[PDB]
Design a protein around this ligand. Structure first.
Ligand SMILES: Nc1ncnc2c1ncn2[C@@H]1O[C@H](COP(=O)(O)OP(=O)(O)NP(=O)(O)O)[C@@H](O)[C@H]1O
Ligand SMILES: Nc1ncnc2c1ncn2[C@@H]1O[C@H](COP(=O)(O)OP(=O)(O)NP(=O)(O)O)[C@@H](O)[C@H]1O
Ligand SMILES: [Mg+2]
Ligand SMILES: [Mg+2]
Ligand SMILES: [Zn+2]
Ligand SMILES: [Zn+2]
Lengths: 10, 420, 422, 10
């Protein structure tokens, strides 16, 4: 399906 | 006419008592997943809320259990694990789930799918206190692949009890959890009624949403603290000498440390005790990075039992790390130590000598970013929902209804801000 | 319709694993005797031989058990002890006999008399392996105060089981052990198939015959010169209880409880008042003169010793500071761990530790400025005239005594040669 | 009955 990626920040 | 020994619900607490550091309990859980009979490749450890109760969940893509196997899993002392293809089970004692769960929380439940049947199992102190059971009785419910209840007499009684006293009121509520195991096979363990001191669960989830942590107010009894003492992630990294499994905590996967890139001036040494036919290798290196945490790392059947044990020079020697695995030694009740035997003693003694040798020889030369998060878009909300790492593949489209995360299983649930 | 949880025989070994120091296991047995439900004045801990097997025996002149009570004793998790007249029970977990015996040996037997009935129970791994049981079953046999059997269905099976796989092959053999409990009431626990390394029991009986000892290859893991308690049972038992109410006799010779006043010099008393507690807790600090290098805190729980020689405050900081300082405190608030050799590492424990050091440090700073065995006893067999060694703590014998009625297994008929005196 | 006594020696 539709997958987006985002940054994880401490 | 001979009687059987009996189990008192009270015992369930007692069995927990050997775990004085909670991570020991958790580790027990991970192990069960890692073991070759389960053979999972991923385990997800999570914190969530259900029914107004904070929960800890351990979920794995593994073979799961027959209904009978579940009974044993909820019974004391049954273990049949065996090595497969050089994959050696940590499990031995038939006790680890009970001590760990119970150390962790009062009440627990197990959902398992083996791809032929699926079953649900209950261990709660709370439940037992309430019905004033004089025996530990573990309710179990089992279904066909078609979700047809299949062992009715046990299952109906089990179900009534589960539904009544369980966290999950209605079958639908149970089956949701069952469906959080995406694969055909796997297991999900939910623990609720977590230990709390003052008004807060024993763990700290606020400090890092990507870790499970012990609050500062932290060092273990034995000894400035290595992270592994207080951060589950840090601990998990070093948990297995040669990982076979992926541990994902709070939806972010764990990065296993590699000795290379961790130690310098590495050298090999050997231990050739009188009492053992086979040789035992040891690896020595100085500690790059923090260089306040040094010692032997002791691994048994590939798992870590003790860390930073100081040997030889307890000051005189520092930053030195040795890695060893001793299958000959026998773990303690909590698997945080070995039985204190002559052999253990000889071994400690040897390590210090060996290490001492290491310092002096080397001693001279030395003196001279997190991964991105993933979301799926619901096709009936258009909302974005967070995803844990480690998922190979998905169905063609995804709806909030089929969210493993308990908290976002409703289309009507506001979308979650991405990290600031 | 719901299933019971089940116990594998394999578990019996498992429950043991908490005890890394054998005395912890022993201590559990003692504790069971001390506790107010049993109420024994004396407990005799002995090493003997039966049927060609070295055994450990614990015998007490306490209240004993109903056949039913025994079952709980041989079952996991059942504890119902309550304080009586300020006599607070140590035991709440319900596991100690089981963890303890099994640490000591593979197989155990219990004989008890409550003065109305006498019962015998079996808890053997060896038995369980042999019949390949899938469940832990504990056979029990019971009698009516005449050597008459009752609860017949169970006893009949149990007895057959005992006779076949037990140390005691005949009823007669059983009754002897029952008979060794001299009083109307009491219990004798026999443990055999003890742990061994390289064909020798882990315990050393030879080096001293009036002690049970751990051989040197001995320092407990935590310690760096060993206090006695670590390797001598007797030495340990001395300090086992803050305010003894029971007589511990080891190897036939009494155990002499230490007293602080004799024990310590420059005694001062200090108080602990954490926020979390509603009651004050007393502490005592002293300098240790006999020893010179056994020092640290002694922590007692419910009048029992959980840990000893725990270093704190400055003593931790450098070896140099704080020497010879000994502290005694009782923390009922803290929670004992599985082996009862430590406490759950809670915030409260940490806080308590933190305080002790500060207080001890306070102490040290102020006062730095300022500075045989009892006779054995014997009885004479009225049939054969032989002299038989007897153990301390027996209030009164019968008028006529015979080799056959000897509690000691090894000297129970007069054919046996008389023992030399020392 | 009769009861002797004796030294126990280390
Ligand atoms: N996640 C899981 N997946 C499949 N089976 C499991 C899982 N967890 C527990 N079991 C089963 O239940 C049993 C529980 O054993 P456990 O309580 O962990 O002790 P053990 O692993 O058998 N040995 P030890 O852990 O040393 O006591 C295991 O033998 C498995 O058969
Ligand atoms: N010597 C004894 N005489 C009479 N009753 C005994 C004796 N030893 C054990 N029992 C009984 O058997 C039970 C089991 O003992 P145990 O295994 O120590 O559990 P517990 O003492 O009740 N609690 P804990 O010792 O903290 O694990 C006791 O609670 C007593 O009722
Ligand atoms: Mg395991
Ligand atoms: Mg006890
Ligand atoms: Zn949706
Ligand atoms: Zn005689």
């Amino acid at each position: 399906a539709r997958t987006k990626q985002t940054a994880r920040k401490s | 006419g001979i009687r059987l020994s009996a189990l008192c619900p009270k015992f369930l607490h007692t069995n927990s008592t050997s775990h004085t550091w909670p991570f020991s309990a958790v580790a027990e859980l991970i192990d069960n997943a890692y073991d070759p009979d389960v053979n999972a490749k991923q385990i997800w450890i999570d914190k969530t809320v259900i029914s107004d109760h904070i929960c800890l969940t351990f979920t794995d893509n593994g073979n799961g259990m027959t209904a009978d196997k579940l009974h044993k899993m909820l019974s004391f002392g049954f273990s049949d694990k065996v090595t497969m293809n050089g994959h050696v089970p940590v499990g031995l004692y038939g006790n680890g789930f009970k001590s760990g769960s119970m150390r962790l929380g009062k009440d627990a439940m197990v959902f398992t799918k083996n791809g032929e049947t699926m079953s649900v199992g209950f261990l709660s102190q709370t439940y037992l206190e309430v019905i004033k059971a004089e025996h530990v009785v573990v309710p179990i419910v089992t279904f066909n692949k078609h979700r047809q209840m299949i062992n009715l007499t046990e299952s109906k009684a089990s179900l009534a009890a589960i539904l009544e006293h369980s966290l999950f009121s209605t079958e639908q509520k149970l089956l949701a959890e069952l469906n959080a195991i995406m694969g055909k096979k796997g297991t999900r363990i939910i623990i609720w009624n977590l230990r709390s001191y003052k008004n807060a669960t024993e763990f700290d989830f606020e400090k890092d949403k990507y870790d499970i942590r012990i609050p500062e107010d932290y060092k273990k009894q034995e000894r400035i603290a290595p992270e592994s003492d207080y951060s589950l992630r840090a601990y998990c990294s070093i948990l297995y000498l040669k990982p076979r499994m992926q541990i994902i905590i709070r939806g972010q996967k764990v990065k296993t440390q590699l000795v290379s890139k961790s130690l310098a001036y590495i050298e090999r040494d050997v231990y050739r005790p009188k009492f053992l036919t086979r040789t035992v290798r040891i690896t020595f290196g100085f500690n790059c990075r923090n260089k306040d945490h040094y010692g032997i790392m002791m691994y048994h059947k590939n798992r870590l039992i003790k860390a930073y044990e100081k040997v030889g020079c307890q000051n005189m020697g520092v930053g030195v790390v040795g890695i060893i695995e001793c299958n000959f030694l026998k773990p303690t009740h909590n698997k945080q130590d070995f039985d204190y035997t002559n052999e253990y003693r000889l071994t400690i003694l040897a390590l210090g000598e060996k290490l001492n040798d290491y310092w002096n020889e080397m001693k001279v030369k030395k003196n001279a970013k997190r991964p991105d998060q993933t979301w799926v878009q619901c096709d009936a909300c258009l909302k974005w929902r967070k995803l844990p790492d480690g998922i190979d593949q998905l169905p063609e489209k995804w709806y909030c209804s089929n969210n493993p995360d308990p908290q976002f299983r409703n289309c009507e649930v506001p979308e979650e801000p991405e990290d600031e």
